[PDB]
RNA sequence: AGCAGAGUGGCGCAGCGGAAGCGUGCUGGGCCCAUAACCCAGAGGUCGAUGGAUCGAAACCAUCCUCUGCUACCA
């Protein structure tokens, strides 16, 4: 099966291969980022140095990113190169690999819920759903994953395209297991100083309403790591707008404690 | 509760833990322990229960027989009487000071607010025994003198060595008499001779006469927090100051002021300091409920301060007066003083030295330990027994009081002299 | 309590969402008249527990434990 919109890689595209044979002209390898077809790596494009013979930096059974130098359009010879390549391209391809893995892992369960003897089953799912997601956005490395992540959290993709009666379960499971929890490492910097005596009760009031628009209690997470430090993970679910909740909450707490003979920053 | 504060002061090397466990059956501890290869140089805390069974012996918790420990190979024995329900006489409190000669300033602070002491004298080291005498002399000056000496070892120590030592001590102490109550040589290595000590310590040792019907003054020496996180049970009924009362009586619900004060905004002048006010929540000792704090006793005064201020050792000697009383807020103060006729703190058999302490001289910075506070000040006028000192942070003069004066002899402070504020 | 690492497959670092990867060391072979250098070949193997997706989890993501590191620290 393919793993990309076309079954034909483009010329000068970043790809992935899996080393499986070593030729007298280089190394014959299968592609695993488009359709699985033969591509020849050349032993004159391995590096621009002294090759006193390696099967311990380039070896069989390893996925390796490489760049398609040429393609013979109707003969299907995908010439490959590592002569001009960078680590950055590898990162970009790794991203596409990981996204393809998660989408295909959801869409493999679907294919095992069906009984088939036609290779084209996965292709049928791909053409209708994948393309309209990916053609618009796939240059940063995106695929169907953005659409799927949006779909579980706000239905609008399962109302525009077909919904299978077993896709949904697996879709929910892989998104909610792997990307819930899902994550921040925000901290509220809070220190307490009191030389009065009513500071103890003052802090409690300040914590419970460190932001307005609450019933009387906020849904913040207070944490005591040490006695003066009150760490507040604010707007906790995933946090995408609780930066202002975090920042301004620190000002409240610092003012309330300052009245009870504290001295704090303005 | 605490009724008498007995101190376990001594000096470098002779075992604190071995002797204290022989007499009381109590071991002292301070967090971040560490249990040493010498004596307890930690600021240990401990209370203890003093019982009678109407025997010449004093019960432990195990009041029929009591097996001590200092080695597991042997089985040490102590006598706790023969049983028929053991009667609580009172709850006593101890003050484990950090040992060694160098810790003199802290020993002074603690001494100045503890009623009595148990001077752990050695025998396996130096014959004139410098520090024992040093301690005794300071004690007789402050106003106390009912001390009961315990000679830690006599088993390892040969009787010739111990005899030469007894001569040299009795000849050095020709000017200091503060050991006119008995001197009990004991074993602590074998944990024996305990029984005559048990009759003695309830008889010879009350609180040496003190004035507790005057005005409440509390001196905090040890810091305690409190309690259990949280978070939100938290915020606390709060932070506990381990202090002893040396004058007056603190009752529950009193407001108390910590009197060195905090200085008014900006330091460009030198006047004035304003005391900080906290109400007493509770008067807690041992694991037994109370609502009182018997004076001449070490009491946990819970005040509404936060854990952070007592997280470790942070208070070593602050003077607290209650309430609406006015100590004078001098910035320049007239000290009377006198010096020791020996330089005592470090001594060798090379005879270096016992020469009289060198006088004070103007434009020199000197440590005035006033109360249990230790503030620094420079001498502006210098007459022999009347110097005028200008202090860095203002000084509350409670009463005519006492002071302790120390000198950096050659690399650390050593006690040189005393005097009185005027 | 908060944070970090590990619970090896010889060592050390632990690679990533398709399994010891790399360097080193050990063991064996080759090269040369011989040794170094140099080139190959090794080696029983869910990698602490409780869970979930999984074709699989030291490594995809949680809940825990233990041993230690940092912050600290109730004691």
Automatic annotation (TrEMBL), chain A:
Main subcellular location of this protein, as a coarse class: cytoplasm
Domain of life: Eukaryota
Tagged with keyword Protein biosynthesis: yes
PROSITE patterns: S1
SMART domains to which the protein is assigned, alphabetical: S1
Protein name per UniProt: Eukaryotic translation initiation factor 2 subunit 1
Domain annotation S1 motif: ranges: 12-83
Localization (cell): Cytoplasm, Stress granule
